[PDB]
Amino acid sequence: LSTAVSTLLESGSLVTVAEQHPVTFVRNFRGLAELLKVSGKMQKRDWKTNVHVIVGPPGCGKSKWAANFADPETTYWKPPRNKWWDGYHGEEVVVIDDFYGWLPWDDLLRLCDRYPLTVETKGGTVPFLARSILITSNQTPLEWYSSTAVPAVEALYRRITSLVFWKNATEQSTEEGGQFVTL
Amino acid sequence: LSTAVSTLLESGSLVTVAEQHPVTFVRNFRGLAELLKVSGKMQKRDWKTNVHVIVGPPGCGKSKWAANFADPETTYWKPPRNKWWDGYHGEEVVVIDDFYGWLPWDDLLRLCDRYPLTVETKGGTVPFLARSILITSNQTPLEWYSSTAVPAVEALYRRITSLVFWKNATEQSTEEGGQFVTL
Amino acid sequence: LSTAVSTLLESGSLVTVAEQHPVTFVRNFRGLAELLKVSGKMQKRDWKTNVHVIVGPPGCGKSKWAANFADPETTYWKPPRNKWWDGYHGEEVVVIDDFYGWLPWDDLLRLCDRYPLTVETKGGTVPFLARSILITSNQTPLEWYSSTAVPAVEALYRRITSLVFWKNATEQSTEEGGQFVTL
Amino acid sequence: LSTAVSTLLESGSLVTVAEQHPVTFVRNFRGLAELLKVSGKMQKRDWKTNVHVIVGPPGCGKSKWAANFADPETTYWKPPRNKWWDGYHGEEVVVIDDFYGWLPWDDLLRLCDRYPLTVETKGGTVPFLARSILITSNQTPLEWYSSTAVPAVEALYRRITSLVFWKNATEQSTEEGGQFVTL
Amino acid sequence: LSTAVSTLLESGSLVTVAEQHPVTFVRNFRGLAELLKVSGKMQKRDWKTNVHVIVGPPGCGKSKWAANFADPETTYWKPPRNKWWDGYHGEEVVVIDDFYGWLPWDDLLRLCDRYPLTVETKGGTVPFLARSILITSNQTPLEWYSSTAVPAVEALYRRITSLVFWKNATEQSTEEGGQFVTL
Amino acid sequence: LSTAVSTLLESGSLVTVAEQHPVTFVRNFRGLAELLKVSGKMQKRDWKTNVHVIVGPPGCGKSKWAANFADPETTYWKPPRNKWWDGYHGEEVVVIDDFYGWLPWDDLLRLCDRYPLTVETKGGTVPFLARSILITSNQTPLEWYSSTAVPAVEALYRRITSLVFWKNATEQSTEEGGQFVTL
DNA sequence: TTTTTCGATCGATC
DNA sequence: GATCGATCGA
Numbered sequence A, B, C, D, E, F: 001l002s003t004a005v006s007t008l009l010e011s012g013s014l015v016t017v018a019e020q021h022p023v024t025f026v027r028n029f030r031g032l033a034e035l036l037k038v039s040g041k042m043q044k045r046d047w048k049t050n051v052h053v054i055v056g057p058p059g060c061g062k063s064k065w066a067a068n069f070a071d072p073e074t075t076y077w078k079p080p081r082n083k084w085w086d087g088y089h090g091e092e093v094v095v096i097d098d099f100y101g102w103l104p105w106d107d108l109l110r111l112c113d114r115y116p117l118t119v120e121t122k123g124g125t126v127p128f129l130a131r132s133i134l135i136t137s138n139q140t141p142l143e144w145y146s147s148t149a150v151p152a153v154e155a156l157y158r159r160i161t162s163l164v165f166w167k168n169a170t171e172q173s174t175e176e177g178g179q180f181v182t183l
Numbered sequence G: 001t002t003t004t005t006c007g008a009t010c011g012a013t014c
Numbered sequence H: 001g002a003t004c005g006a007t008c009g010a
């Protein structure tokens, strides 16, 4: 057990213990969770999460690019139209699928921001630790939200790291700066 | 329970652990759930779901062919008019019966894609891993939703793998699929 | 101990497990319940549920007849005018009393079919396994809905098994069914 | 454990026990928290939680200053919009970030008082012990709550300690409550 | 633990057990509390609970009079805005602070009576026994509740034992009951 | 513990196990209750439970008489606006006080019926062995449950044992006859 | 168990 | 004026 406590308290979250000594995590699982939350070393997020938007008409292999962006061991495909992040437990790359505007504006800002955040799950809370949010969508970011119900739409475009677009060509071409508002 | 952990991390289904090991699942039943949920290795969808729309006027055995699709056991029946996939627990056949369009259009566009998804249950979420969604109905897929209310709009009529109509009180004739927009 | 699981897998009921081996049921009770709930498939239904409609002028001794169909201890008396079948555990007389057109049309058509359904309580879902539905009403089954709002429109009468009527202060007469639209 | 309980009863803080001998805190973690609740040595608040308010248009570095106010080992970043102080098991700094009024008025009045408070966590209760509440906002404290729908707007202002404001696109300058409705 | 059970049987207070033998109280705390509940030697209430009401404009110093009143160690500052009394576990100042009616009417009548009452926590129920309640407000009690939406509002004023006011920027001059309404 | 089950499964549970075997009940307290509930030996009831209903404006000693009815040792007070019957681990006066209609009507009837019942507490279920329910109110007993919201108002009337109104501010008088819809 | 989640009320838009 | 959606409270 002190081995499990070593691998937990020294560094990481419960996932590393689950990968190191499972037989000591099937037992004492609630107490490792409370030790982690009380020790204070529960991993915050102190980095910048890249945000790659993808735009294209339905059928252009949008989601294929997302599923091929990283290994399926480290992709959390967020369920749609919910505020719940259930099952996450840290999964580096987060692909918000086909996102037409079904997330609160300030919450979308805070996912794409660069400072700690704890997202919510059904009956608990899980610390957000993503590193590349792939926002697969259908329209340009200028049609997700309306300027009426938003403080300032620039506050989101400031965070879109890259932006792949689909034009009348079988390839998907990145966007060099902004023809529209700059990112 | 050393064998139980090594068997759980490979098959990734608690039912298999219980069946292959009754005794060590009576104890540590919660811990195995948390180990599965945290370690990863949960069975996620990475295949294509095969939609089989069945359509005809009432009383023609729409449901008869729905439950005919083997087995009578491994067939989740989606609760009507609702959002929650409660109690699903992992099946392979999902028979949405007597459809009108009650599932939101985007959720139906997403049930029939080729990528992981997480459905909602009243108290959590359960991974959705289905291989055929028998959408029994009464109308053709053209009039499930209003012509203007759908914004895509040809993203459902792509993924409809099969189709069966009901002709003039004679038999269920497999629709050839060419007359309508292609499938 | 080990023999508890041996006696559970050959019973299918916890009651005998408690009777024969109580000492190891005072401990480990939570796990036998989970084992039964996870190793035994949920109970579907495949039996046409008889729908005996009771209709007459008000106050004609309808409720007493309803309770007299079967044992009152296994009879539900569904909370009227809402959509929460508060469990009730599966109780296999169902008496919807004073029905006058408030359940949705397709929901009622589904409640009286040969294929499984799952009505929902507040905070969960209960499998619906009814051998008899006793629709006690006030007026004719054709006045429950108008043919404009119902695009079926004669699909209910297939599901009605028989009909019970009260003639001009003679008795609760059992209908022929051959004069009006057939049963 | 026989010594761990001795430390717990006289240190009065579960964090101390969790850091001294984690292994006997992994087991018996409910027990220690319940002994601490019963014995009465659970830590209250009797000091004044000095509240810093930061204002300025987005992207000007409000959040960076908030992460540079204290060590990241202690700053608890409040989860947004959802009134659940989960992940808190103490220590001084609390940075409610990007505030716009998403907290009930009385709770914002009562966090900043000098007297004990217990906040909700997801299935429990955590005592509040902060020493600095850095509220970060884009709007002056006037536009957080409407004057008419508030019993007395002067109550919140009395509890603000410092007010830092961004001016003229060069650098944020501390205010003294002259121009603002003073505190 | 036989000594601990016997020393609980006659004293009937978990506080005493936790004072004498913490170690046993750490390991089995649900057991001792349930044993105390079942044996019937709980602590019912048979005494009128004084309700001192303080009214004044904010900043006049209402709450400092509550914070100094009985003892810093035997006051339970009620968590606001909700019906949970967690962590209370005995005794006898209960100071509902900053009140304006955010507690259910019948429950507020019932807190201020002579007959027993069990109050609700996150995990179970802890018996209520308060020798004096201090209620702090900004309005007079005449407008804590809608005078129309309450059947008989005299039943609250009858329970207040002392209604202490704030005069014209001088002091907290105790008002005399029965003049303006009953007391 | 072997003898514990033998004593448990005779009668009069769990009060007599807790009296006779204090040590073995500190452990296994959830499991003895579960074994007893599973077996058909929860000391059931066949006696029509008495219902005394009191009506009078507040301050007229409604609840005083309820307190002065039986021995306080064997009295339970139902905490209002709360469907949990925690504290029923003794019995047999039940005084639902200060009623305004806050119980589900069918359950209220079920408490006043003759059949055996099992109410649910925080941590399982408890048999409802009541003999006298002193339903104390302040308004006319009819208005508690609206006739539209109830299938039959007279069903509640049938199980009332006795009723008491209040006189012209002097006396408690027993109501005799058919001033309202009698039983 | 609590949480849910569900239901009711209020506000805004057509 | 009615229906649907969103937000808040329990």
Ligand SMILES: Nc1ncnc2c1ncn2[C@@H]1O[C@H](COP(=O)(O)OP(=O)(O)O)[C@@H](O)[C@H]1O
Residues within 6 Å of the ligand: A057, A058, A059, A060, A061, A062, A063, A064, A065, B113, B114
């Ligand atoms: N494992 C796979 N095997 C074969 N083809 C695949 C696989 N994964 C993706 N594809 C192809 O990628 C395409 C994805 O299309 P689809 O997901 O419907 O559109 P979008 O990706 O834009 O949502 C399909 O046409 C399919 O042929």
Ligand SMILES: Nc1ncnc2c1ncn2[C@@H]1O[C@H](COP(=O)(O)OP(=O)(O)O)[C@@H](O)[C@H]1O
Residues within 6 Å of the ligand: A113, A114, A115, D057, D058, D059, D060, D061, D062, D063, D064
């Ligand atoms: N480690 C770092 N190295 C260089 N620049 C940094 C570092 N951390 C933060 N910054 C800068 O500080 C700024 C903080 O931005 P942000 O937190 O969005 O401001 P606010 O939250 O107030 O809108 C970023 O623009 C970034 O360039």
Ligand SMILES: Nc1ncnc2c1ncn2[C@@H]1O[C@H](COP(=O)(O)OP(=O)(O)O)[C@@H](O)[C@H]1O
Residues within 6 Å of the ligand: D048, D113, D114, E058, E059, E060, E061, E062, E063, E064
């Ligand atoms: N350090 C201090 N110096 C001077 N006055 C103080 C200090 N701390 C608190 N007070 C005074 O104590 C009183 C009570 O504080 P508080 O309870 O927060 O206000 P309220 O009575 O409105 O709830 C206030 O009037 C405040 O002016």
Ligand SMILES: Nc1ncnc2c1ncn2[C@@H]1O[C@H](COP(=O)(O)OP(=O)(O)O)[C@@H](O)[C@H]1O
Residues within 6 Å of the ligand: E113, E114, F058, F059, F060, F061, F062, F063, F064, F097, F098
């Ligand atoms: N020891 C006592 N001394 C004086 N009066 C008492 C005592 N015990 C009970 N009472 C009286 O009993 C009455 C209870 O009535 P009330 O509080 O109106 O009941 P409820 O609030 O439940 O309707 C009070 O008026 C109170 O004066």
Ligand SMILES: [Mg+2]
Residues within 6 Å of the ligand: A062, A063, A097, A098, A136, B113
């Ligand atoms: Mg897609």
Ligand SMILES: [Mg+2]
Residues within 6 Å of the ligand: D062, D063, D097, D098, D136
């Ligand atoms: Mg910020």
Ligand SMILES: [Mg+2]
Residues within 6 Å of the ligand: D113, E062, E063, E064, E097, E098, E136
């Ligand atoms: Mg105060």
Ligand SMILES: [Mg+2]
Residues within 6 Å of the ligand: F063, F097, F098
């Ligand atoms: Mg009363």
